[PDB]
Amino acid sequence: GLVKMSHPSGDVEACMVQVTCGSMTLNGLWLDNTVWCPRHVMCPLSDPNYDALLISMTNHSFSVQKHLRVVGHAMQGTLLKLTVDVANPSTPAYTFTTVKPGAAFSVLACYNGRPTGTFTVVMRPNYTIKGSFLCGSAGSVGYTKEGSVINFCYMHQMELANGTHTGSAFDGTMYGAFMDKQVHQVQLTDKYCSVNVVAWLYAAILNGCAWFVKPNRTSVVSFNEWALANQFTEFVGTQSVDMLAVKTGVAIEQLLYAIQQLYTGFQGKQILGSTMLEDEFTPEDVNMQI
Amino acid sequence: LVKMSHPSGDVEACMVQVTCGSMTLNGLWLDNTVWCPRHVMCPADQLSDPNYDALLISMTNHSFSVQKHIGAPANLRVVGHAMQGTLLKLTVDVANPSTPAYTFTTVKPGAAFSVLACYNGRPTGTFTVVMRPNYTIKGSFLCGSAGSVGYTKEGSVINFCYMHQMELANGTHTGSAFDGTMYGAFMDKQVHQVQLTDKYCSVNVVAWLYAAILNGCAWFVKPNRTSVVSFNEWALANQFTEFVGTQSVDMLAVKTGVAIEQLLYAIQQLYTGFQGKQILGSTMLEDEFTPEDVNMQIM
Ligand SMILES: Cn1cnc(Cn2c(=O)nc(Nc3cc4cn(C)nc4cc3Cl)n(Cc3cc(F)c(F)cc3F)c2=O)n1
Ligand SMILES: Cn1cnc(Cn2c(=O)nc(Nc3cc4cn(C)nc4cc3Cl)n(Cc3cc(F)c(F)cc3F)c2=O)n1
C-alpha cells in the first residue's frame, strides 16, 4: 500500500519568520535579502485597496522576527516582497514554479513564525488543497525538492467556507483566482485527477489486483472528451506514467477504458481493499514506493 | 484530517552514516554518542546467524567510520564502542553541537510517531506511523533505511522511540527502542520470522468516528449502545484491541454529545461492512488517527 510521504522540512524551517504590520501578524519566508509574505498583513478587511495600503506604508511599518530590519517594500500580486538588511545565511538553492492540479507537494505549517507540523497534499482540480491549517497559519509554505533544489510553490492564504484552503504561487498569483479579502467565496466543483487514478490502478496491478484490466482500449483524445462530462481532469501522459506501463505491460489506454467502467461502479469487487477511486497518489509516488 | 508529522529539522541535524567493514547504515548522533543498529557489525557470512557477542570482541574503535553529510559536514572519530541490546553505542570525540533536548521512551501499540527515513545518512522523507498491536509498523522504507529514527516532540523535548531495523514482510517493518529492545521481540538476523496477527486499534477507530461526527458525517450513529466491558469481550473475538478510555476521548464525547458506548456499538455494525456508504472519504474503518491527533487537528 501507498504511504503519504513529505520532504524533510529542515531546509525550509530555517527560512521561516514572523511578519507583523500594525495589529496583524503572520508567517513569512526569508530567502537571501527578501522576506515574502501575504499582503493581507497590511490590512487594518472586507474590501481592502492594497495599492493605496502599499502607498501608506512607511519606513517602519513592518517588523520581522526570526524565532531583521526592513529596508524596502514592494507588492507582487497577492504577496509582499520585503527587503531586509541581512541575508539569510542558510538560503537553500531554490526556484519559484507554479504547481498544476494533481501534483503533490509538502507543506510546512507554521504559527507566528514557528514551524509546527508537516504534511503532503495534492493541488485539487478546483485549485484548493485539503490541508490541516488553524488560525495563524497564513503564510505557511509548500514546496517540492528535486536534488537539493527547493521549488517553492505555495504560500498559504485562506480557509474557504468548506474546510478547504487556498494560497498563492510565488509569482504572486492566487491559485484559482480567489480574492484575498474576507468575503464569502465558493470553489468550483472538484474533479478526479485522471493521471493519479491511472497511477493508483498501476499500483493495484503491481500488487496483484488486476481484475479490471481488459484488452479494450480508450484513446487519450477520446477519454478526454468523456472526462469533460464526467468530472475527471484531462489525462496528460508523462515519462513517469510510461515507466508504470513498461513494468506492468499494461497500456495507459487499457486503464482509461477501465476508469470509464469503474466510474459506474466496482461491480461487486474491491481494488486494494477500497470500493472508491483514489487520486491522491501520483505516478511518481507509485514509482518510488513500489 | 491529514497525516501530520513533526517538523524534521531537529532530527535531520543528528543523522550520520555509520560504516563497518562492508556494512553501512544510518546512525543517530546525540552529544558524544552515535546510536546505530548492531547488525552493521555482521559479515556477509553469518548474516543469518550472527554471534554479536563475539563480533563485538573482534571490533576496535577503528572498525567504525562515521560521517555527517548534510548541514555542517563530518570529522567524527570513534573513541569508544559498546553494545546495548540490538543497538551499538559508539562514543565520538566531538559532542553534536545541534543535539536537541531529548528523552528515550518506548511507545505502546496505538500511539503515533514521526519517522525520518534516511539513506546513507541522508534524510529523504518523513511520515507518521502508529505502532501496530503486533509491534510492527507500516511505513515507507527501502533498502538503506536501517537506523532511521522515529520520534515525538513535546515542547522543546524530542522523545526518540524507534530506530529502524528490518523489513519483515513487504510493507511491514520493526525496529528497536533506544533502550535497545526490539519491538515485538523479533530477532535482528536474516531469517524468516512470522508476526502475530494485527488488530484494529479500537480507541483510534473511536477517535476517527468522532472526527466524522464533527465534520457532519454521522449516519452511523444510533441510540443503541454497547458497554465498554461487553465491547472488550467482543473485541477479543474479532481482532480489535481492548478499548481503554482517556481524557482525550472524553473531550470528543462532550463536544459532539455522542457517548463512547454509542460508537462502540457502531463499530460492531461497521466491521460487518459499510454497505455502500463512506465515512470521511473511506469505505473501511481507519485506526491510524489518535484521539490527541483529532483533538489537535479539528480543535
Ligand atoms: C482556520 N484557518 C485555517 N487557515 C487559516 C488561514 N488564515 C489565517 O491564518 N489568518 C487569517 N486572518 C488573519 C487574522 C489575524 C489576526 N491577527 C492578530 N493577525 C492576523 C493575520 C491574519 Cl492573515 N485568515 C483570514 C484571511 C487571510 C487572508 F490572507 C486573506 F486575504 C483574507 C482572510 F480573510 C486565514 O484564512 N485559518
Ligand atoms: C526494503 N527495506 C525496507 N526496510 C529495510 C531495512 N533494511 C535495510 O535498510 N538493510 C538491511 N540489510 C543491510 C544491507 C546492507 C548492504 N550494505 C552495503 N549495508 C547494509 C546494511 C544493512 Cl542493515 N535490512 C536487512 C536486515 C537488517 C537488520 F538490521 C537485521 F538485523 C537483519 C536484516 F536482515 C533491512 O531490513 N529494507
Side-chain angles (χ1 to χ4, degrees), chain A residues 1-44 46 48-64 66-68 70-145 147-180 182-266 268 271-290, chain B residues 1-44 48-74 76-153 155-238 240-246 248-274 276-283 285-299:
Chain A
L2 286 318
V3 175
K4 249 56 184 291
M5 196 160 347
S6 307
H7 292 290
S9 60
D11 277 342
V12 181
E13 279 168 69
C15 299
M16 295 312 300
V17 292
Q18 175 177 14
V19 180
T20 169
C21 181
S23 74
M24 303 282 283
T25 196
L26 40 61
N27 307 281
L29 183 72
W30 177 30
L31 309 166
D32 300 307
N33 272 89
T34 299
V35 177
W36 302 86
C37 73
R39 68 184 178 173
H40 191 59
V41 74
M42 292 194 300
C43 200
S46 73
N49 185 340
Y50 287 110
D51 292 323
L53 287 175
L54 219 229
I55 300 312
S56 77
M57 298 291 106
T58 64
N59 284 338
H60 294 93
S61 289
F62 302 93
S63 184
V64 176
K66 183 183 170 75
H67 306 290
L68 279 186
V70 160
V71 181
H73 48 254
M75 187 163 64
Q76 179 158 331
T78 58
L79 300 183
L80 303 180
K81 198 174 164 189
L82 300 186
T83 309
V84 290
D85 62 358
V86 178
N88 185 352
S90 291
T91 305
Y94 71 92
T95 61
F96 286 149
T97 319
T98 305
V99 283
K100 311 226 187 112
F105 56 94
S106 291
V107 175
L108 180 60
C110 308
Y111 298 89
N112 281 16
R114 307 184 138 83
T116 57
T118 199
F119 59 86
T120 183
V121 297
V122 291
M123 181 61 68
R124 297 308 309 175
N126 66 0
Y127 296 104
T128 61
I129 58 175
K130 307 186 171 173
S132 177
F133 297 105
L134 298 165
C135 283
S137 62
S140 295
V141 164
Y143 52 98
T144 60
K145 217 200 281 183
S148 34
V149 184
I150 315 274
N151 180 62
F152 292 106
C153 61
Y154 182 87
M155 178 160 274
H156 184 52
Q157 297 258 5
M158 297 169 280
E159 188 163 292
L160 302 188
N162 289 78
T164 72
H165 305 107
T166 201
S168 317
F170 284 79
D171 67 0
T173 68
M174 190 82 63
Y175 286 96
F178 297 100
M179 309 177 291
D180 55 336
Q182 75 164 358
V183 54
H184 188 247
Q185 306 179 71
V186 56
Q187 68 296 317
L188 298 184
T189 178
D190 209 6
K191 309 173 180 185
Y192 290 103
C193 300
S194 290
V195 66
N196 290 354
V197 176
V198 167
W200 175 69
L201 295 179
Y202 275 126
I205 293 155
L206 288 171
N207 292 126
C209 189
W211 57 267
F212 50 84
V213 183
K214 307 287 172 84
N216 312 64
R217 292 164 51 108
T218 295
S219 74
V220 172
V221 175
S222 168
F223 177 86
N224 283 349
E225 259 174 79
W226 172 90
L228 294 162
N230 292 275
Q231 289 334 78
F232 283 71
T233 58
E234 147 189 310
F235 179 89
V236 177
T238 70
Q239 158 135 32
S240 177
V241 182
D242 286 344
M243 276 201 38
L244 294 186
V246 174
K247 55 174 96 176
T248 63
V250 174
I252 288 153
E253 288 88 359
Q254 295 174 267
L255 298 196
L256 293 192
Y257 180 91
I259 291 172
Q260 288 180 315
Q261 323 308 310
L262 285 170
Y263 185 55
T264 292
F266 282 33
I271 299 178
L272 297 180
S274 177
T275 59
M276 303 215 73
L277 298 172
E278 164 76 85
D279 75 347
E280 306 194 334
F281 293 97
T282 66
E284 291 84 2
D285 286 337
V286 177
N287 268 310
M288 68 171 213
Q289 281 185 40
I290 307 192
Chain B
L1 227 50
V2 167
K3 293 310 188 86
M4 188 81 55
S5 300
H6 295 286
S8 56
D10 278 346
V11 175
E12 290 171 54
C14 300
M15 299 311 300
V16 291
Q17 174 175 10
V18 176
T19 291
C20 180
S22 39
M23 296 295 269
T24 191
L25 40 66
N26 303 285
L28 187 66
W29 183 24
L30 301 174
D31 303 315
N32 286 98
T33 299
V34 172
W35 298 93
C36 73
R38 71 174 176 175
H39 188 70
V40 79
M41 287 190 314
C42 187
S48 275
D49 206 51
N51 186 344
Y52 286 116
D53 288 319
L55 281 303
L56 184 68
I57 299 154
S58 66
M59 293 300 154
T60 299
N61 291 336
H62 292 104
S63 317
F64 299 106
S65 100
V66 179
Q67 315 166 78
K68 174 182 174 36
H69 297 297
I70 62 131
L76 293 213
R77 260 198 330 137
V78 177
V79 305
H81 69 281
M83 182 168 72
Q84 192 173 315
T86 62
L87 296 188
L88 290 188
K89 208 184 149 178
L90 307 182
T91 304
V92 294
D93 63 353
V94 179
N96 181 352
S98 301
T99 303
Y102 77 89
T103 62
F104 293 151
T105 300
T106 307
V107 288
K108 307 202 217 54
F113 55 95
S114 299
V115 175
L116 181 62
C118 308
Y119 299 93
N120 310 130
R122 194 171 309 267
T124 63
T126 193
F127 50 86
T128 297
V129 302
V130 306
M131 180 58 61
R132 302 302 317 172
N134 65 359
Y135 289 98
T136 63
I137 64 170
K138 294 167 174 200
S140 184
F141 300 90
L142 318 162
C143 285
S145 65
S148 291
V149 157
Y151 62 95
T152 59
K153 199 177 156 70
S156 75
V157 181
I158 305 272
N159 186 68
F160 292 108
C161 55
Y162 181 87
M163 179 156 273
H164 187 62
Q165 292 258 12
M166 306 176 288
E167 178 153 294
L168 296 166
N170 207 252
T172 289
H173 314 103
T174 196
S176 315
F178 279 82
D179 71 357
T181 69
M182 189 78 71
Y183 286 98
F186 297 96
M187 306 178 287
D188 53 333
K189 56 198 203 183
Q190 191 92 68
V191 66
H192 194 320
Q193 311 170 71
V194 48
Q195 325 112 50
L196 310 167
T197 311
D198 208 6
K199 299 175 171 157
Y200 279 112
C201 303
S202 308
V203 69
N204 298 350
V205 178
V206 163
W208 173 74
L209 295 178
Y210 275 131
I213 294 159
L214 282 168
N215 272 108
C217 176
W219 60 261
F220 50 84
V221 169
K222 303 310 180 41
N224 302 66
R225 299 181 175 221
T226 295
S227 77
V228 169
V229 316
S230 164
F231 178 90
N232 286 340
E233 308 185 339
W234 174 92
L236 285 164
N238 284 272
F240 275 75
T241 58
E242 168 190 14
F243 176 90
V244 182
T246 70
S248 197
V249 179
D250 297 344
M251 288 202 276
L252 298 161
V254 164
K255 294 197 292 156
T256 59
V258 178
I260 288 166
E261 291 82 355
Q262 283 170 280
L263 292 188
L264 298 188
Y265 174 93
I267 282 169
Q268 289 177 321
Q269 321 311 310
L270 293 167
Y271 95 115
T272 323
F274 285 17
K277 301 162 244 201
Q278 59 145 261
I279 296 166
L280 295 172
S282 164
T283 57
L285 297 177
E286 165 74 86
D287 76 346
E288 298 242 331
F289 297 103
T290 70
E292 294 82 8
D293 208 10
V294 170
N295 279 113
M296 259 299 158
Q297 292 200 39
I298 318 296
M299 227 54 246

